[PDB]
């Protein structure tokens, strides 16, 4: 028995737990940003989009997200924010959107 | 990683290889990418090694790492000479 | 209404010769005329001319036979021993130049219709084309 | 194995002299020489009209029973002859005439074909220098069939290559008696051979 590959498993678990955590924030902030936008709170709705952006690319740094997966997220996010701010918004900090 | 190695084609005790380009992960005698030569280790004929420096040089120029033996054979056929 | 006019002509000819008629009429058509043009050149018929039967355009096909023979049944040998329709409505038959057949080790002919016109297997092969294998004749 | 056994009996069944003994088959004793009726308790009774089949069967036997080849090898050769270009019957005969054991016979190094065969399997023969012990070895044109020095001094080889002095040999061949060596000049042309076999019938035995 005993085939030291259980190691690969051990590691997978640590990695799993690391990815899991990273994605979780990305979601939380994304939602959060989407929420403030759908409320007209432009200055900070962007403020947070900026963080979400960072966290996404950052996740894509290693193998948590990686790929065009990162890009989709960034896309869909800016997509929903700029659009929701179509309620008088008027991008302030433009902390991410290029108007 | 594509390679330039030998492929077994003779018969029991009558080995005959084929210098060949292929993806490192394929069976040694499997689907190769291109044959770029042949080689008879027992030199049963005055023609026991042929290459095609032109093609060898193409693949080399695009990755293709050769086996030590293949590298050897390629060299012997003037693949790397520059003089 | 005729179903396959070329087959009709092929048959009218076949029949008429079995009773050794001098000539025999067939409703006219460019296409039928074109085939006749070959039957004549290849020397299977003494030739043909356009007549006007009862007001309509027909084609006298003058038939040809061998000479009177010895013993019983002195009927001449037929010049046209065989004439078969091949391609037919409801089973058209085409061939590439490479697929044009050779009728009786050459002793006969096959008439095919090509975009270079109605040719014999010799002519077809020469012009290097193929087409709808119309009929066989020997 | 290759038959081994009463041979001047095959001669009798085939009703013709097959030379499977060289000498004696010339003396007043080949049996075909006085006692021409087939072997066995029935050979003298009047024969019944043979079926076309019987003819070809007997005809194929005659031809094969001459070179001492096994039906197996005989068949394979004929198949090779068929597939090859040129008139099969011809090609077949030539191919048989190309067996080394046979050449060794045509050249006289040996009395009969069986004897010849043994001289080959026993290494007394050489081809272009290197010795060859394969009775079925096919000789190409230009090859030098010979005796190996180590064998040139054997009583049998002597009597044999001696009796060959002055004796002429097949036109598709050539022999240098003193050098105990000969050459396979050309595939014997059908006309060169004078076998008591109508090979057309053999081609037919294998068509059925």
């Amino acid at each position: 028995r005993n085939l030291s590959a259980l190691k690969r498993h051990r590691q997978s678990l640590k990695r799993r737990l690391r990815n899991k955590a990273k994605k979780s924030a990305i979601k939380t902030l994304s939602k959060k940003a989407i929420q403030l936008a759908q409320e007209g709170k432009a200055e900070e709705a962007l403020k947070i989009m900026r963080k979400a952006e960072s966290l996404i690319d950052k996740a894509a740094k290693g193998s948590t997200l990686h790929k065009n997966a990162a890009a989709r997220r960034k896309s869909r996010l800016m997509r929903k924010v700029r659009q929701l701010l179509e309620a008088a918004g008027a991008p302030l900090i433009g902390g991410g959107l290029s108007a | 990683m594509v390679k330039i190695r030998l492929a077994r084609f003779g018969s029991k005790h009558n080995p005959h290889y084929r210098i060949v380009v292929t993806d490192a992960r394929r069976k040694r005698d499997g689907k190769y990418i291109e044959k770029i030569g042949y080689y008879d280790p027992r030199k049963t004929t005055p023609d026991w090694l042929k290459v095609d420096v032109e093609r060898a040089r193409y693949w080399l120029s695009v990755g293709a790492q050769p086996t030590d033996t293949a590298r050897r054979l390629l060299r012997q056929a003037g693949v790397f000479r520059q003089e | 209404m005729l179903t396959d006019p070329i087959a009709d002509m092929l048959t009218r000819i076949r029949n008429a010769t079995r009773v050794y008629k001098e000539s025999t009429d067939v409703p006219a058509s460019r296409f039928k005329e074109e085939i006749l043009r070959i039957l004549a050149r290849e020397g299977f018929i003494k030739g043909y001319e356009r007549v006007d039967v009862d007001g309509k355009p027909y084609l006298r096909v003058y038939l040809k036979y061998g000479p009177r023979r010895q013993g019983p049944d002195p009927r001449p040998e037929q010049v046209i021993h065989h004439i078969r329709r091949i391609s037919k409505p409801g089973r058209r038959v085409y061939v590439g130049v490479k697929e044009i057949p050779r009728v009786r080790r050459g002793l006969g002919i096959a008439i095919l219709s090509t975009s270079k016109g109605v040719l014999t297997d010799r002519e077809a092969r020469k012009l290097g084309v193929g087409g709808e294998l119309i009929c066989e004749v020997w | 194995g290759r038959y081994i056994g009463p041979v001047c009996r095959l001669c009798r069944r085939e009703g013709v002299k097959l030379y499977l003994k060289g000498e004696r088959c010339y003396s007043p004793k080949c049996a075909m020489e006085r006692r021409p009726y087939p072997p066995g308790q029935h050979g003298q009774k009047r024969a019944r009209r043979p079926s076309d089949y019987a003819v070809r069967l007997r005809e194929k036997q005659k031809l094969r029973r001459i070179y001492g080849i096994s039906e197996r090898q005989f068949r394979n050769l004929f198949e090779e002859a068929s597939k090859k270009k040129g008139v099969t019957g011809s090609v077949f005969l030539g191919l048989l005439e190309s067996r080394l054991d046979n050449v060794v016979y045509r050249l006289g190094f040996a009395v009969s074909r069986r004897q010849a065969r043994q001289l080959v399997r026993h290494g007394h023969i050489t081809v272009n220098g290197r010795r060859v012990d394969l009775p079925s070895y096919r000789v190409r044109p230009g090859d030098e069939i010979a005796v190996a020095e180590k064998s040139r001094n054997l009583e049998l080889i002597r009597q044999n290559l001696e009796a060959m002095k002055g004796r002429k040999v097949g036109p598709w061949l050539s022999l240098d008696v003193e050098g105990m060596k000969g050459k396979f000049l050309r595939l014997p042309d059908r006309e060169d051979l004078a076998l008591p076999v109508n090979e057309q019938l053999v081609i037919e035995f294998y068509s059925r």
């Binding site: - | - | 409801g90 089973r91 058209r92 038959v93 | -």
Partner: protein, 104 residues
């Protein structure tokens, strides 16, 4: 090259989607007789531009959905239910040739 096919539009009943009946011809692999088979393609009509009876070209395209991988390249000839009819009648014939019998 993205495949291009021609056919008649035999169904409008879908949003931004038309059913194009494409007829095909060819020699029977063993009997020679030139036979005629056909197949319906659900092509993408974004601006619901094409209607029943429209002979249209169909172009091989990126999946727009399931069962839908062609867009209408263009309009060949308009109006001509003679075709839609053949089709419709053939479908209606199926009518009851089951336990009873269709309609002739």
């Amino acid at each position: 090259p993205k495949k291009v096919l021609t056919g008649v539009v035999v169904s409008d009943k879908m949003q931004k989607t038309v059913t194009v009946l494409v007829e095909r011809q060819f020699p029977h692999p063993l009997y020679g007789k030139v036979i005629k088979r056909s197949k319906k393609y659900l092509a993408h009509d974004p601006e619901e531009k094409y209607k029943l009876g429209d002979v249209v070209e169909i172009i091989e395209s990126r999946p727009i959905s399931k069962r839908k991988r062609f867009r209408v390249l263009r309009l060949v000839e308009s109006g001509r239910m003679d075709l839609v009819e053949k089709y419709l009648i053939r479908r209606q014939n199926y009518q009851s040739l089951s336990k009873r019998g269709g309609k002739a």
